Amino acid sequence: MSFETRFEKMDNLLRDPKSEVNSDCLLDGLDALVYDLDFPALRKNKNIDNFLSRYKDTINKIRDLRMKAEDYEVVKVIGRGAFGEVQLVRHKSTRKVYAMKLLSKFEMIKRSDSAFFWEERDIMAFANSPWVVQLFYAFQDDRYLYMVMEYMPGGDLVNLMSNYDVPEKWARFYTAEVVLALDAIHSMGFIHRDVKPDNMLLDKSGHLKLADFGTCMKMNKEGMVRCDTAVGTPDYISPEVLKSQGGDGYYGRECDWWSVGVFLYEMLVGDTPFYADSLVGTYSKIMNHKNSLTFPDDNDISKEAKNLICAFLTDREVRLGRNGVEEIKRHLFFKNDQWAWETLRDTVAPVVPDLSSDIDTSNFDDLEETFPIPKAFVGNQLPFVGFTYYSN
Amino acid sequence: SFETRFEKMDNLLRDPKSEVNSDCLLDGLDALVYDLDFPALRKNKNIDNFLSRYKDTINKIRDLRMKAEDYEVVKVIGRGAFGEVQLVRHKSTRKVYAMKLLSKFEMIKFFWEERDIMAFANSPWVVQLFYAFQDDRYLYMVMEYMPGGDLVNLMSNYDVPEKWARFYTAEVVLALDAIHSMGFIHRDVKPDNMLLDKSGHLKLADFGTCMKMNKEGMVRCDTAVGTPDYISPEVLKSQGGDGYYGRECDWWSVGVFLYEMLVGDTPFYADSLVGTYSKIMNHKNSLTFPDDNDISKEAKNLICAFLTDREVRLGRNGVEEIKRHLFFKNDQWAWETLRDTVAPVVPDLSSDIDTSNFDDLETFPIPKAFVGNQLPFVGFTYYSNRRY
Ligand SMILES: O=C(Nc1nc(-c2ccncc2)cs1)c1ccccc1F
Ligand SMILES: O=C(Nc1nc(-c2ccncc2)cs1)c1ccccc1F
Fold first, then answer.
1. Which residue ranges does the record assign to the Protein kinase domain (chain A)?
2. Chain A to chain B, count of Cβ pairs less than 8 Å apart?
3. How many whole angstroms separate alpha carbon A101 and alpha carbon A81?
């Protein structure tokens, strides 16, 4: 490569939104550095003290100029988790309305889990799919990570199911939209591993978008993923993701198809197929699914609906989807006279949200520990350098 | 406004004088990786995961950015406690420069001024800085090569007739005025700092002792700075109570430079180093000229005009009184057009890499905890954000 080439490859790396060394990523590195060094114990070191003094006024200017949490007026808290909360926000200046997901830095290190958010960030920021909730901005500070997404006023499928005894025609639509959405994620080289109605959001038109990609992972050369992670609510998780708690096994995308079948069973039956009072009881039923899977006597569920569920609720080796989406798509359950796969999101959804305003939260039910002072360099902000992201 | 905030923030990453431009930011991340990558520190998971996450990335950057291996070293032209200076050929561009290496370790045991002056003087009187870069061990300053060598070399191989001394003194006066105009006092003007270009014209290099003057063009410095034979009496006495001095201290050195060119020795030479300091202090009585019918009336006057106490020293009331001096009265050059004239010694060079005018020629321990040795050097890079 020529000197000019070398200069421009480097220049374009500072401008790339997908670059690990983008001006915002680099700015994080400096912001972290200042945060993790500014303590009386550490300032004893002159290299450290002079650096902080040199970058004092500068770092403050930057901190104020860059996107901060105070740029958003919080309209309502729409969701809440261990990590932190999800909230309907209005950007004070642009007066634009978004949904913002806050993740506690202390609560992530405390819990040891610090890497999921990278996948959630990447997926939402770069999917460029009608099936994925869009990330417009990602920013941070010493306490939280912030993800500014598009607001999905239709609420989640949990809310839909809780208000309706779903007819088969609706379930067919929602399952189809999910299959399409998951295929989109799979095409990006990702497996979700915990697909549930909580992750299924509805836009202003009643169409599906997947959100909350916290359990997402990039597939290896073989479209597989290993995992030494613990399970949180097994109800929708595949037997293989449970079978591999400790990294004792790789699994492919067919694990998400299992969750699809569960989603269908729940929409038509009214309960999940492996529910048990205790959490461990659910895990047992999932494991024993060959015998634990039963359908109620009311011949309400059609032949093809019962078949698709069982096609998905089997061991991976014989599970529908093992040979790609097309065998799922070809299933007779999806045989209809309302929509075509290639034009489904352009059709009229079964439940169209009637909204009062850009800030209507009717489809959402109504609903702080700090790091200690370091006695030596601990670098609490380092696992988050490069999380900042802006759109142009 | 949102768009103002975005703009202010964007203009800061582009500014060559900004503390947070691409150069500085890339320097920080590079410093962070360097100061953390040790087995003792990698015991910390926050630290180890960060390094692992940025491994391939940091290497790509390190390879893409200007590195020392991009230059083929042609010859070591100067050497110093600080480091070495070397004639280099940039392997790709095949372009020839002089590169000044400064040992980071040897410093922790001034370069910001040297960098700024050379990178932004935009003066024919100052050696040009094209690039500045670094690594874990050294700072690198890629400057234009001055093949005419230093005035020390000229003086050592010639007996300088008055007509030549007049030229070189004049070029120095102009060069120092340029530095002064930038708000700096050289504080160590010597023939070692005076380099000659391909045409035989002067350029000042090595601004190691340069200090920015205050509001009233003064400098409060509690410690002596410079070389023993050139140090002014005021910068020699420079202490707690005193400390305060102006640009007239460089004019003292100009007189020393003239005396040496014409006489052949410095005016306060003594066998011992301490003996020189004594003579400097007693400049009123120690300044003598040999029985030399060749040192003119006006040359002797200019020397004494400069080799006096600051209060009555030529230059106290600006350059124009130095310029107006009869010593500079001539029919060869005008001050305005002087660097456009033909120099008294025009270098006869064999190639772009001729080094004939140049005489022939450990780091930090491994940290047991975070010490941040690369932090005092974040921003030194002059590559991604330069003035054009
Ligand atoms: O992560 C979560 N929810 C999410 N909701 C949105 C969203 C909401 C509305 N409009 C666009 C996007 C994105 S992620 C979550 C997880 C566990 C517990 C509570 C939670 F709220
Ligand atoms: O700093 C020093 N020399 C310098 N030489 C140049 C230069 C040389 C050639 N062409 C352009 C520029 C720049 S600075 C020095 C000081 C003390 C001891 C040895 C040294 F080499």
1. 72-334
2. 100
3. 10
Q: Looking at the domain B150-348, which fold is it?
A: Transferase(Phosphotransferase); domain 1 (1.10.510)
Q: CA end-to-end span of chain A, whole Å?
A: 30
Rounded to the nearest angstrom, the distance between the alpha carbon of B194 and the centre of ligand 2 is 10
Instruction: Report resolution (Å) to 1 decimal.
Output: 3.2
Output the ligand 1 site: residues, CB below 6 A: A 78-81, 86, 99, 101, 133, 149, 151-152, 201, 211-212
Range A1-155+355-392 has CATH code 3.40.640.10: no
- Give the DSSP letter string of B12-66: HHH-TT-TTSHHHHHHHHHHHHHHH-STTGGGSHHHHHHHHHHHHHHHHHHHHS-
Nearest chain B CA: its distance from A384 CA (Å): 9
- Has B100 been labeled as part of a binding site? yes
Q: Which residues pair with B103 in a beta bridge?
A: B138
Architecture of the structural domain at A156-354? Orthogonal Bundle (1.10)
CA dist B16 and B22 (Å) reads 9
Technique employed here was X-ray
> Angle, to 10 degrees, between the axis of helix A46-65 and the axis of helix A23-37?
130
Nearest Cα neighbor of B253 from B317, B176, B312, B180 is B176
The reply to whether CATH 3.40.50.720 applies to domain B1-149+349-388 is no
User: Nearest 5°: CA angle at B285, between B284 and B286?
Assistant: 105
Q: CA–CA separation, A225 vs A221, rounded Å?
A: 10
Q: How far apart are CA A254 and CA A321, in angstroms?
A: 6
Q: How many CB atoms lie within 10 A of CB B383?
A: 18
Q: Are B182 and B117 in contact (CB under 8 A)?
A: yes
- Which of B2, B20, B46 is opposite residue A94, by nearest beta carbon? B2
The answer to whether A379 contacts B50, with C-beta atoms less than 8 Å apart, is: yes
User: What CA–CA distance (Å, rounded) separates A202 from A182?
Assistant: 15
Give the list of residues 6+ apart from residue B172 with CB closer than 8 angstroms, or none: B189, B194, B202, B204, B254, B257
Q: Which residues pair with A48 in a beta bridge?
A: none
